[PDB]
Design an enzyme around this catalytic site. Structure first.
Site, PDB file in Angstrom:
ATOM      1  CB  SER A  27      -2.280  14.320 -13.335  1.00  0.00           C
ATOM      2  OG  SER A  27      -2.791  13.724 -14.611  1.00  0.00           O
TER       3      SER A  27
ATOM      4  CG  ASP B 208      -1.661   0.944   1.250  1.00  0.00           C
ATOM      5  OD1 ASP B 208      -2.014   1.839   0.346  1.00  0.00           O
ATOM      6  OD2 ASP B 208      -2.488   1.379   2.604  1.00  0.00           O
TER       7      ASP B 208
END
Length: 330
Positions: free
Chosen positions: A199, A35
Site C-alpha cells: 500500500s 481464505d
C-alpha cells in the site's frame, strides 16, 4: 469457463463469510470460508472426532461415487489466530458457483481445534493463496483456483465482500458492473505464498494522506485490518476514549463513539473504509466498551488487509503468469 457464488456473513458483525461449495457425487453442499491467506481446502467430515463436531455439515466420502482416498497423504495446518486442524485426503469433484474441478484434493479433518468446533456456521476452509503453502504431505496439492485456472476464461478470481450483507466470489471474469471508476492494479510478491502487496499510504477521517509504504497481505480469511502500531495509534487517537487494552487484546473504544473513516492507498488510488466498518461491537455481551476493527500487527510479523479493508473494495486476484492485485471502489 466461469463460476459465480454468493458469500454471506456468518453473523451480524461480519466475523467471517461462508460460500456454498458442492463436493462429490451426488453433491454434498458445505459452507466454506474462502481464505486468500491459506492454501488448503479442508472440511468437517465423517472422519472428524465426534466430540469436535457441533452443528457443522460434514462431508462423507463413502457416499460420494467420485471420491478416492489419496493414499498415504496427510495434512496439518495452524492459522494465525491459533486455531488448527489435521487429517487425511481424498480427491473428488468440487464445484463453486457452477465452476467444476475434477480431482480436487479435499482434505478431510480427523481433528479440529476448539474454535472450529465452537463455530457451527463454518464447515471448512477453501484456500486461495498460492499452492506453495499447501500442507499436504508427502505430495503437496493444488488449490481449487490453481486447478481451475487453465480452464477459466481469464485466470482471475474476484472478491466482493459485503458490509453487513452478502457479496460475491467470481472465478474467470471481472464483472464490470460490480465497481465504480477504474481498477488500479499493483504488484504482488509470491515469495511467502501470499497475495502480498505494498500500500502507498493512509489517511484517518478527513485528514491528510500520509505517503508511506505498507507491505501486507490481502487476506479474506482474516476479519480485521492489522497495520503497524504507528498507523493504528494515529487512527485511534481520533476517537475520544479509545485505548489499547492488554486484557481485552487490542484497541477498544466507547460504544457511543462515531468512528472516523480510514483510507488506504493503492498506487495513486484511494480506498475509503467507512467508520462503521471498524465497529466490532461490545467486547462482551452488554458492555459499553466496543472492539476496534483496526488493530496493531506488531508481533504478527506481517500486516494484514483483512475483511475490514477488503469489503470496502472490489478486489481482483490476478493469477496470470506474473500475479497482480487490483482494487476498485464500489
Amino acid at each position: 469457463s466461469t463460476g459465480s457464488a454468493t458469500t454471506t456473513p456468518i453473523d451480524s458483525l461480519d466475523d467471517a463469510y461462508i460460500t456454498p461449495v458442492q463436493i462429490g457425487t451426488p453433491a454434498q453442499t458445505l459452507n466454506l470460508d474462502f481464505d486468500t491467506g491459506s492454501s488448503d481446502l479442508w472440511v468437517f467430515s465423517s472422519e472428524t472426532t465426534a466430540s469436535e463436531v457441533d452443528g457443522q455439515t460434514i462431508y462423507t466420502p463413502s457416499k460420494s461415487t467420485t471420491a478416492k482416498l489419496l493414499s498415504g497423504a496427510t495434512w496439518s495446518i495452524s492459522y494465525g489466530d491459533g486455531s488448527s486442524s489435521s487429517g487425511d485426503v481424498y480427491t473428488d469433484t468440487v464445484s463453486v458457483g457452477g465452476l467444476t474441478v475434477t480431482g480436487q484434493a479435499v482434505e478431510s479433518a480427523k481433528k479440529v481445534s476448539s474454535s472450529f468446533t465452537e463455530d457451527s456456521t463454518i464447515d471448512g476452509l477453501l484456500g486461495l493463496a498460492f499452492s506453495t503453502l499447501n500442507t499436504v504431505s508427502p505430495t503437496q496439492q493444488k488449490t481449487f483456483f490453481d486447478n481451475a485456472k487453465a480452464s477459466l476464461d481469464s485466470p482471475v478470481f474476484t472478491a466482493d465482500l459485503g458490509y453487513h450483507a452478502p457479496g460475491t466470489y467470481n472465478f474467470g471474469f471481472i464483472d464490470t458492473t460490480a465497481y465504480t471508476g477504474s481498477i488500479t492494479y499493483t504488484a504482488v510478491s509470491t515469495k511467502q505464498g501470499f497475495w502480498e502487496w505494498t500500500s502507498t499510504g493512509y489517511a484517518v477521517g478527513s485528514g491528510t494522506f500520509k505517503s508511506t509504504s505498507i507491505d501486507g497481505i490481502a487476506d479474506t480469511g482474516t476479519t480485521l485490518l492489522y497495520l503497524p502500531a504507528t498507523v493504528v495509534s494515529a487512527y485511534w487517537a481520533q476517537v475520544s476514549g479509545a485505548k489499547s487494552s492488554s486484557s481485552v487484546g487490542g484497541y477498544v473504544f466507547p460504544c457511543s463513539a462515531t468512528l472516523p473513516s480510514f483510507t488506504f492507498g493503492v498506487g495513486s488510488a484511494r480506498i475509503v473504509i467507512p467508520g462503521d466498518y471498524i465497529d466490532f461491537g461490545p467486547i462482551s455481551t452488554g458492555s459499553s466498551s466496543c472492539f476496534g476493527g483496526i488493530q496493531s500487527s506488531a508481533g504478527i510479523g506481517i500486516n494484514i488487509f483483512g475483511d475490514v479493508a477488503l469489503k470496502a473494495a472490489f478486489v481482483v486476484f490476478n493469477g496470470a503468469t506474473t500475479p497482480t492485485l487490483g482494487f476498485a471502489s464500489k
